[model samples]
Target: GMQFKAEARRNKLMGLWVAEVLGKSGDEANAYAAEVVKADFEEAGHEDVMRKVLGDLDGKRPEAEVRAKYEGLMAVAKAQLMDEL
Candidate 1:
């Protein structure tokens, strides 16, 4: 009932990564992708319909914005990244 879009996105990514690394068959990959897309239509009451990203639709790189966002995310992701330094 809570956190639909995020959980679906997470599951889809996990499925895709696992399928890719294990070299799953074509059908498997297709099915995984389908399941990922399908989850969006489910009755997840806490769905985030507008949370969908409209990024990259313009067909141009948002270099500056992308980089800054990436940096922020990476900083949190690899907090231990520089901690080892």
Candidate 2:
């Protein structure tokens, strides 16, 4: 359950970050983050999320940059959740 929660949190964080990069803010950004979390359920692993994110960005950001941000946010999400526990 913890892993699931952490992954979801990571997706949220990644989504918000990407939204900011795309010049979104406030409720709009939050809505985008929610979509990112939902995107995770399209299939197993991270490809689904990647596809959604990359498609939304439309080449505004590089794949490696998005990957790095996602990886980093995963660690941050785990750490924050562990602290909450």
Candidate 3:
């Protein structure tokens, strides 16, 4: 449950970045983040979220780019979670 919570947190943070990139703001941004957070729960680990993100981008964005962003934000998310704890 804790790991799931942590990943959900990370997904929300990552979703913010996604929303920014997609030019979404306010409620739309929150909705996008919520969708991404939901994606995180579709299966185990991060695959579902990544796949959904790729799909949302319509395959225009490269997988490496998305993966890089995920990895980078992971540290930021972990740091934020640590601070919260």
Candidate 4:
């Protein structure tokens, strides 16, 4: 359960970052983040979520960059979740 929560949190964080990169703000940003959170459920691992964000980014950011963001945010997400507990 904690693993799932952390992953979801990471996806949302990644989405918000992408939103900013895409020039979105306010409700638009939250909406896009929600989409990213939902995308994770499409498959067993992070690739599905990565694909969605990378596709939405449309070459504005490289896969390596996005992957790095995901990796970094995952650490943050886990820490945040631990704090909540």
Candidate 5:
């Protein structure tokens, strides 16, 4: 369904954004993003991804930075999802 696809893609986009902040690239980045995508599958909604994200972050970065990036990347993710439609 569109909802699942959108959320999964959003998780991927967020993962990539986080990976950038984590200084990951190439296969590492792809792998990390893929992991985030799977994280969304650990449950029926977005909380799994959020948990993984919070755990991965573990306070290394400020909350504002994470929120800003999440918000910005969510927009990008939505755009990309629309393009795929």
Candidate 6:
């Protein structure tokens, strides 16, 4: 149960992180995470998050800016996380 919750929370939080990275919010991240989580849970591996992320990112951002934002988000996700491992 612990691992499952951890992974679920990780995935959900990752989605939220992606939103922030894209200058979005948890509200915007929910559907993105849900769709990706569903695919991850299914036998066929439903659709990938790339599609959803791109769609979620549609017309709202420039390509070059996303990279720096991705790095910043990653830096925070790793460094700012609770160091319990």
Best prediction by TM-score:
2
TM per candidate: 0.33, 0.91, 0.80, 0.87, 0.74, 0.42
Sum up the clashes in candidate 5. 0
Cα lDDT tens digits for candidate 4, 1-85: 6788887889888889999999999999999989988886668777787778888999998888888998899889888887987
Q: State the lDDT at 83 in candidate 4.
A: 90
Most lDDT-accurate candidate: 2
Ranking by lDDT: 2, 4, 3, 5, 6, 1
TM-score of 5: 0.74
lDDT by residue for model 6 (32-85), tens = 556445444444222454446556677466645644443344344454344555
- Per-residue CA lDDT of model 2 for 1-85, tens digit only, reads 6789998899998989999999999999999999999986659888888989999999989999998999889789999887987
Question: What are the per-residue Cα lDDT tens digits for candidate 1 across 1-85?
Answer: 4244444444454344434544666778757545544544654532422122113113233445433432344334344334545
| Model 4 C-alpha lDDT versus the unseen true structure | 0.87
Q: Give the worst 10-residue stretch by lDDT in candidate 6.
A: 41-50
Among residues 3 or more apart in sequence or in different chains, the pairs in candidate 4 whose N, CA or C atoms overlap within 3 Å are none
Residue 24 lDDT in model 5? Answer: 85
**Model 4 lDDT at residue 4:** 81
Worst 10 residues of 5 by lDDT: 40-49
The root-mean-square deviation over C-alpha atoms between each candidate and the true structure, in angstroms, is 16.4, 1.2, 2.0, 1.5, 2.4, 5.5
Model 2, residue 8: what's the lDDT? 88
Candidate 5 regions with alpha-carbon error over 4 angstroms:
none
Question: lDDT for every model?
Answer: 0.42, 0.90, 0.79, 0.87, 0.74, 0.52
* Per-residue lDDT of 31 in model 6: 68
Give lDDT: candidate 5, residue 51.
Answer: 66
The TM-score-based order of candidates, best leading, equals 2, 4, 3, 5, 6, 1
- Residue 72, candidate 5: Cα error in Å is 4.7
- State the displacement of the C-alpha of residue 3, model 1, in Å, after optimal TM-score superposition: 1.0
